């Protein structure tokens, strides 16, 4: 990974994402959202990100 | 000195009825593995001060 001043930054678009793989995961030290649910993602529907 | 006696709901199975008081404190599981009383990862307390 790249440094902090040097954040790595990606964009990935035209896919489908499956949060919930990601979410029942207990191996990350936090796992916070500030806008959504944690549990919706799966329900929703964007771009470009 | 920080007013910490009032509390509000913040996790629910589901929205209230009109007019309907919840007074249950119960944890609850924001994952998909059992509480059984312990406020750890994926359980949380609805209240919040």
Redesign the interface.
């Known amino acids: 990974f790249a440094s902090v001043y040097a954040w790595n930054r990606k964009r990935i678009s035209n896919c489908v994402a499956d949060y919930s793989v990601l979410?029942?995961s207990?191996s990350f030290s936090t796992f916070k959202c500030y806008g959504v649910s944690?549990?919706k993602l799966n329900d929703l529907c964007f771009t470009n990100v | 000195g920080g007013n910490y006696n009032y509390r509000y709901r913040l996790f629910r199975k589901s929205n209230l009825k009109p007019f309907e008081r919840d007074i249950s404190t119960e944890i609850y599981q924001?994952?998909?593995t059992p509480c059984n009383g312990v406020q750890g990862?994926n359980c949380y307390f609805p209240l919040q001060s």
Do not use: I, L
């Open positions: 979410y029942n207990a944690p549990t | 924001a994952g998909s990862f």
